[model samples]
Target chain A: GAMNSSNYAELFNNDIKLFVDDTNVYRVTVHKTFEGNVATKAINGCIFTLNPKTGHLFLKIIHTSVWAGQKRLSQLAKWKTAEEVSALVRSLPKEEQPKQIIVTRKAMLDPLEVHMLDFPNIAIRPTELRLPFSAAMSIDKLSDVVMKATEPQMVLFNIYDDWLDRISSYTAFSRLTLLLRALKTNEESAKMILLSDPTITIKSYHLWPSFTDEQWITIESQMRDLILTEYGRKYNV
Target chain B: MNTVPFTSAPIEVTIGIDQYSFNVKENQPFHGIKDIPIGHVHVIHFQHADNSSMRYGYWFDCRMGNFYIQYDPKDGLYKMMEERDGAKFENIVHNFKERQMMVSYPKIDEDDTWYNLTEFVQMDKIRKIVRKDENQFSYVDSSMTTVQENELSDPAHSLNYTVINFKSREAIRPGHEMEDFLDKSYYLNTVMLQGIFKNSSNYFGELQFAFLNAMFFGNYGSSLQWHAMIELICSSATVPKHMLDKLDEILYYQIKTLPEQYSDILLNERVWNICLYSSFQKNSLHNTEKIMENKYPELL
Candidate 1:
C-alpha cells in the first residue's frame, strides 16, 4: 500500500482511514480540515453512500453553490438559444436595446459560467445531503441513519477484495484530478466529491437521488477513462 | 484652446522641477491623452539662457512631436502622463500634480539663444481639451463576445480567459438590475486596487472573526446576525458608473482583439463571488460542526 505513494498523489484519498463494515456498507470520515481559498465549505466533514458493487458510483449533493443558488445561477445560461435573446432585444425600445440587451445577457451567464468553468476545486460540492422524502421528514443528525464503515471480517472481505485497490490506483486518481481541473465552479466540485467518496452501504429506499441522467452520463464517460490501460490491453476488442 | 473653450483657469509649472505644460487640441490625435479621442500636441521654443521667452507650435505630428501624454482612460480624470523628448533627444516631463502636461522644443537655438522670452501659456486650456466624439470616450456601443468553445477546452487558458470573458458571466449592465435577485448585482471596480479584503476591519476580517466567535461560543443570535449580513452583502452592492466605465474599456479592448489578459476587474468580481459563496457554506458547516461538538464534548 505504501508503494502507491508518490508526488502526484491525489489531493483526495479514498484509501486512508477508510473501511467497509460487516453490514456490507462502506463509510468514510475525513478528520483533516480541507481549508481552502476562503471558498472551501466542507472543512472537516464525512460522507457515505451505497456501493454499486460493480459499476461506477452515483452522487447526491446536499449542499453547494448550485444546490443553493441553482435557479439564480442558471439564469446566466438561460437564454442558451439565440432566438430567445434576439426576441427579448427586439421587444425592448431600440435606443435602450443596444445599451441594454448585451449587458443583461452577460449578467445572466456570469454565475453559470463561474460555477461551471472557473476554478473547479472540490470545495463546491454537496456536504449535507437531502435524504429521501420519508427519511428527510424525520432525520436530523446524519449519524441517525448513516454508520461508519468499519473493518470487515476476513471471510467477507474476499467478496470484492480487489475493488478498493483498483479504485485507489493512480490511473483512477489522476482521472479525477483532470476532471477537477476541468471543473468550472465549486458546484461541480461538490458533485465530483460525491462520486469520488468511498462507497456507502445504506439501503436503496434510504438512498438519495443525486444526479440526472445527463449528469450520470457525463460522470460515466469520465469514470470510464479510469479503466486502466493495462487491463484494456488484455482485451483485443 | 479653441477646441475646449477653456472653462477652467490656467495653472503655472516650472522647468528645474522638470514640469512643462501645453494646450491639448480636440480630435488632435495626441499619443496618450485618455477619455477624449484624438488629442494633439504642441512644441515649445524655450530660450535656453534664462528659460524665459516661450513660443508654441500646434497640430504637430504626435509620434515625432515634442511632447506626449498617456493615461488609463477611465482613471484619466486626475491621473495623466506627459513627456517631452523634443526635436532633440533632451527630455522633460511633468512631476507636478495639477499641471500634468509637458512642453518640448530646442533649448539652445543657434542664433535665437541671445534673448529670454517669458510668457505663461495656459496648460489648463489643454487639460480641458474636451472632445464630444462620444465613441472615443464611451464603450456604450460595445458588447462582450462569447468565449469560444475551443478556448474553454484549454485548461490553463480557460482559467485566465474565464476571468475577462464577460460572455462567461451573466450580463447585468452597470446600474441596471437583473430579474434574478441573487445574481443581479454587479461589480465594476477592480478589486485588485481596493482589494476584496483591503480593510481588515470590515466583512473581510471583522465579520469572519465575529462569526468564528459566535460559533465558538455557540450563540444562536450571533449566528443569525451574521447570516443576515451575509444575505445583505449578496444582494446590496452593484457596479457604480465610474467603475463601469473601466470595465467597458477593458472588455472593449478584449472584444476588439487589441490585447487580452485576465483583468483586475474580473479577478475582483471572482473574489467577491468566492467570498459570498464561501460565507454561506463555511457558516453552515461551522454550525454543523459546532452542533456535533456540543453533542460530543470530547469530540473537541
Candidate 2:
C-alpha cells in the first residue's frame, strides 16, 4: 500500500475550473467517469474542480464515496500523515497556489488533524444535519437547511441509512436544483453529489422511481427549466 | 505438561468441532489435571499439525477414565479465565521456504493473549498408515450389518440417506463402552485424512470439509441438534441451492444413525442431557464471522 504513493500523487493535476462555487470561490469538478449513483467501491476516484478564473486556487471536496473508500481513494484524508494532500497543495501552480482550502463532507471526521500542523492553512469542516423527525424523516427538512445556509458553491448530500429515499425524492431533487441555481446564479455552473447506503430491504429501485436514462434526462430538463425560469424573472422581465 | 495453543493456527484449518474446557500453562514435564469445573471444546479446530499451538490433547477424565463432560468455552472461559505462558525446546522446523526454522513454545499467558507455538510435528507416517489402495476415506461398516445396509437402501426405510449413513458408517453400538468409540488413533487418522483432503473450493472437496464438520460435531451432539446447526450454517452461506442441498443430505445421512446406535448412551438421561444441553447452550455463543466483522468492518 505504501509503494503506491506516487500513483496517488499523479491524481493531482492542473485543470480549469468549469464550475466555481462563489462562496469561497471554490471549484466544482469531478472525475471523467463520474455520472451519478456512484458505488462506494470505485477504485479511481474523481476530484473537485481546480481554480482557473483568478488562479487563486480553491476546491470543493464533495465526493461522498470517500466516506466508504477507507484509505483507498482519499489516501491523505484517512491517513495519520496528510503528506499527500500537503504535496498536492504544494504541487499547485506557483503563483496561483492555493493558500486556504475547505473540504466539507457529512462523514468527514478529524483523523487528519495531527498532520494539519504541517498545513495550518487547510481547514476541514465536518457537517452533520440530524433530521428533526425521529419517527418519520422528510427531505423538506434537508431542503430547509440547505436553503437557509450560505450559498456554498457545491452542496454534497450523503444519504445515510434510510435517508436515501428522502433525498432521492423528486420534491427534494427540485429544491436541490434551486439551491445549485442560487450558488451558480451568475457563475457558469454548480455541483451536487448524492451518495448513500439506501438500506433498501428487498429492491432499491422501488425507493426511487425506476427511471431509465431518457426519463432521467427529461427530469434533468425540467430542473434546468426551473433554474432558467427562476433566474429569467429578474434577467428577462 | 500437555500445553495446547491459546487459539487455532491458521496454516491449516477447516470448519471443525472438538471437545475441550480450558488450556493451562506449565513447564518441565508436568503431571496432574486441575479439578476445575469447565470442559468444552465446543468449536475448536481438530486436525493434523505440522506444528500448531492450539489443540486439546487427549487426557483421562480423572475419576472416570473414559468419561468427558462437554462444557461451553464462552461461559467456561468467561467462568474459568478470570484465570489465564513460555517454553524453549529447539527443534528443526520447516520454514515457509521449506528450510530449517528453529521452533519452541515456552509457557506464558500474560494479559490473556493466545499463543501460536509450534508442535515440531510429522505427517507422512500417519498418512501412509491410514491410506488404502481402495477408498482413501471409505467408511468402515463399524457396527453395521448387511441386513441393516439393505434396510437403509429402501426409501420405505422411513429415513433418507441423510439420516441413514450415520448407522452404517460410524455408529456407536448400544451399551458399548465409551472407549470403544472414542479411539484416539482412529480419530487422529480421521482428522489427518480430513486435513490432507482440505481443498474447500472444489464442490466435492467442500463436501469432504462439511462431512468432517458434521461427523465431528455429530458425536458431541444428538442427530437433531447437529442437523439443526448444519441447516443453519448452510442457509447462511452464499452457495448454489442444489449443491448445498446435496451436501446437507450427505451430511445428514452421515450423522443420522449415530445418535440412535449409541441409543444406550442417549438413553442414559445423565449422559444424554449433558451432551444435548451443552449442544444447545453453546448456540448462543457468537459466531466467528460476527466477532471478525466488528474487528475489521472493512472486510465485511
Candidate 3:
C-alpha cells in the first residue's frame, strides 16, 4: 500500500484524485457542471457511480440516444428483410444486391481509457455485444437515440481488495461515451423505400407498438428540441 | 511570429488550437501547405524545429506516415511476436538525449503510431554524416510506413493481440458514423490539451495550483455559448498562433461554464484542511478550494 505512496500523496495534493472508495478500477473522482439542462427536463448523460461490489464502473443509459436507437432498429429489423432493408441505402448503385439479412446489434460497450490502456492491464474477457433489431427499424432510429443522449464518462480508479496484493484491483475503471450516431442524411435514403415504413407496414406490433406513432413522433421531436436547445444552440457545427 | 494566420479579417488574427481523433475535423487543419498530411514530416517543419535547437525531423516523419501496428495486414494476426513489444517493420532507435547524433522525436498520431526512420538506418540507405567534429549529424532515412500488426502485438499475453489490435480499436473513417451508441464507448481516446483547474488568479501564489479542465478539445467537446461563437468563427485548416487570444473568447464563456462544473469538482474533506503548509508560502486560500467552499457551502 505504501509502495507508490509518492504518487498517492500527489493525488491527495490535487494533481489528481483517486476514488475515495479504494476498491475501484480507474483513477477517477472528477466534478463537472453542465449548465444548460434544467434538473429533470435536461437529458443528462449517464452518471456512472463506482460499483462497490465488483469494482466495476456502472451507469444507466437513460437518455434519448440509446432509447431512440433501440426503438428504431428493433422496429425496423422485426418486419423487413436484410436485403429489403439494405435497399434504402442510397450510396449503393443499381448493380448490387444485399447479403447478410440479419441486423444484430448491442446496447452497451467497453471503452479504452488512456491511463488504463497505457499501463498494460484489462485482462477481464471483454464481451462484444451487438444490438440488432429487425426491418421495422432503421439505423437512423437507433443512432439518433444515442446522438441526443447525455452520457457521462465514469471511472473507478485503482482498488485495494486487501486479500490480493494489487491484483486487477489496482487497474482503473473508465467508460468512454464515444458519440457514433449513425445513419447520415446522405446514406439514409436511396431512390426508393424497399419496404414500407416499419411503423405502418408491420401488422404485428414490433418495437413501435410500445408507443403510439404520435407518441413516438413526439419523443423524437422532444429529443430533437432538447438537443437543439442544449447542444444545437451551443454547437451547431 | 508564431501567431496563427487570420481567416476572418485584418484587425482580427486567429490562434487555432484543436485536438481531435486522427483524420477527424473540428475547425483545425490536420494538413499543412500543398495538402501535405500534418502528422509526421509536416508537423516537424511547422511545429518542431530541425536544428541544433531541436530535432524537428522526428516529428515530421511520424505524422503522415502510417502504421498498421499488426503483423500481416491481410490477416490482423501476429503469430511470431504475438504479444511482444517489438516493431515488425519498425525503424531503428535514435537517441535524442544524446545530441551525440542528430536525432529527432516524431509526432505521435492520435491513434499513437509513429514513423520508422530507424528501419531505414538499419537497411543501410543512410549513414552518420560526420561533416565535422562539432557537426554531429546522423543522416536519417526518410522512409515511412504504417505500424504492422506484428509490430504492435505484445509478446507477453495472447489476449493483448486479441483485444488490443488495430482492428479491435475504434477505427473510424473521416465521416462515417456507426449506429451502435454503446459500442462507441470503446473507441477514440483523444482528450487533448486539457487544463484541469489551473488557477490563474494573480492573488494566488504559484502555477502548480490545479489542472481543472473546463474545456475538452475532442471532436464534440465544447460548451453551448462557445460552441455558438465557434460555429461563426468557422473551423478550418490553419495554425494557431495565439491560443490565449483566439481561445480566450471561448475561455471567457468557459469562465461562465466553470461555475456549473465547479459544484461537482471537489477535492475531498481533506482538501479543506490544506492552508499552505510551507511557511515560506503566504497565508491564504489556495484557490477554488477556498472560493468553492465559500461559494457552495452545501456541497462542502
Candidate 4:
C-alpha cells in the first residue's frame, strides 16, 4: 500500500484526522479548531478507497457543509486534503490503472472547478462538457479555465441572462472574439456554437433583469460575427 | 393588321393556310427565347383542320421593331420566326397532346440534328408550365439531303434550342376567373417563398430564430400559415425594413445562381404567377393585420 507510516505522517497534520472503518477503508476528516476552544470540529471529509478488482484509486467526497457565516466550513473545505490523498493513493504500486475521483452529491463546488485546479497534473485532459450555470457565475470560475485550455479542449458556454448581463455591463468584446476564435478552429466547434440556442427568460423577479432590444443588438452583433466569421473561414470565401 | 378585342373564348381565324385559334387580348411584355426582351409576341394555337388531336402552334414575334411570316416549302408549313443575336433563330412551338412546349432553332446545316433543347410542361391545377426537361435532343437526322426521311426524323427541323411557355397567360387571357388573381408581386412572393423553404435550414441561428419566431407568432400550424408569413414579409406596406432587406438579399442570391427548374419561372412573366391565388386570398381573409401585430408589436 502507498499509505505507509512515513506517508501517513506526511498526509495527516494536526488539523486533519485519519481513521478507517471496519472494512478497512481510509476516511480522512479535515477539521478546524476555533482559536479560543481546544475542541476540533469536523467540517468536511473524503473517503480514499481502492477498487478491489481494478486496484485503482477511488476518492469520493463525504458531505461538504454549506453553512452561512462560517469561513472554515465552506463548500471547498475538504478538496485540498482530498487532492493530497489522491496524489499519494495514485503512487501505489499496481498495473496500469485508471483513477476515478467522483462527487456523490450536488455540492456547491462544480466538478469542473476541481478539475481546473488539477489541470496538467491529471493525465486525462478535460475537453468538451456542459457546465451548469458556469457562465452565469463569475467569469473567473470557468471562462478563465476555458481561456487557458488548449485548442483541443473545445467548449460551448451556454448563454443565460446573467451571462448576457455580464457581457453588456462591461466592454467584453475582446473576450467574445477570443471565444469565437477558439470555437471556429474546427467544424465540430463551429456547428455546436452556431446551432445551439440561447436561453432567455422574460419573467420578472429573476436574478438578472430582462434585456432591451438595444442591448440585444449589441449582443446579437457579436453572435452574428461569430457565425459569419466561421462560415467565411470554413468556405474560404 | 387588325387589333382584336379581348375575348372570353379562343377566336377561330385563318392565318395563311392554317386555321388557328387564340384568345385575342393585349399581350404583356415577357422574356422571349434566350431571354431576349420582347414587347409583344402573338401566341396562336394551331390545330390541323383534319386532325383535331395534333394541337400545335408558334409564337409569332410581332414586336414594334419588325414582324414577318414566311412559308417554308421544305416543311410545307407556315413559319413565323425571329432572328436573335444575328446568328440564332428563336421559335416556340406547343404540343397540346403532350402538354408541353419546345423552343428550338431552325436546322442550320442540311444534316444537322437538334440537341441541347429545353422542354416545358403545363402542370395541372397550376396555371404555369414548368421547365420539365432541359439539354434534351432530337433524334439524329440521316445525312441524305432528300426530304422524306429527314422530315420524318426531324419533324420540327430545329437544332439546338430551349423552351418556356406562357400557358398560364394563355389561360388567363381568355377572361377566365383567374385573370384578376395573378400579378407581378405574386410571382416575386412565390419565388421568395421557394427560396425561404429551401434555404432557411442552412442559415445561421439568428435568421432561423427570427423565422421561427415569426412562424410561432403567425400561428403556423400548416403550410397556409407559412404562406401568410411569407406574404407579410414580401408586402411592401406591412414588412419591416430590415426583414425585407434580408429577404431581398436572399432573392438576389437565388437569381444569381438560378437553378434550371426555376429559370423559366423567373424569365416568363406569364409562368411567373404559378402559385394558386386562392391560398393568398384565403390568407388575406384570415385577419392578417392581427397576425402582423402579434409578430411585430412595435408596429402598434
- Cα-based TM-score, every candidate: 0.19, 0.19, 0.16, 0.17
Instruction: Arrange candidates, best DockQ first.
Output: 1, 3, 4, 2
Which of 1 and 3 is the better model by lDDT?
1
DockQ score for model 1: 0.05
Tens-place lDDT per residue, model 1, A185-214, is 233433453356345332343322234445
- Model 2's number of clashes is 19
State residue B265's C-alpha deviation in candidate 1, in Å.
Answer: 20
Residue-wise lDDT of candidate 3 within A42-129, one digit each (tens)?
Answer: 2322222222223332222233233343344333222222111222222335332121111122211122121122223322111122
Model 3: what TM-score for its first chain?
0.18
lDDT of 3 at B88: 26
- Which digits, one per residue and each the tens of the lDDT, describe model 2 over residues A179-200? 3443344222322211122331
Each predicted complex: what DockQ? 0.05, 0.01, 0.02, 0.01
Candidate No. with top TM-score: 1
- Give residue A128's lDDT in candidate 3 (0 to 100): 29
Give a tens-digit lDDT track for model 3, residues B78-181.
11111123342222121211222211222344532212211111111111110112211211111221123235333321111011222232332222223211
Candidate lDDT scores, in order, read 0.27, 0.29, 0.23, 0.29
In model 1, the runs with Cα more than 4 Å from the true position are A1-168, A171-237, B1-300
Better of 2 and 3 by lDDT: 2
Residue B254 lDDT, candidate 3, scale 0-100: 27
For model 3 chain B, give the 10-residue run with minimal summed lDDT: B203-212
Report the CA-based lDDT of candidate 2 relative to the real structure.
Answer: 0.29
Question: Which candidate's lDDT is highest?
Answer: 4
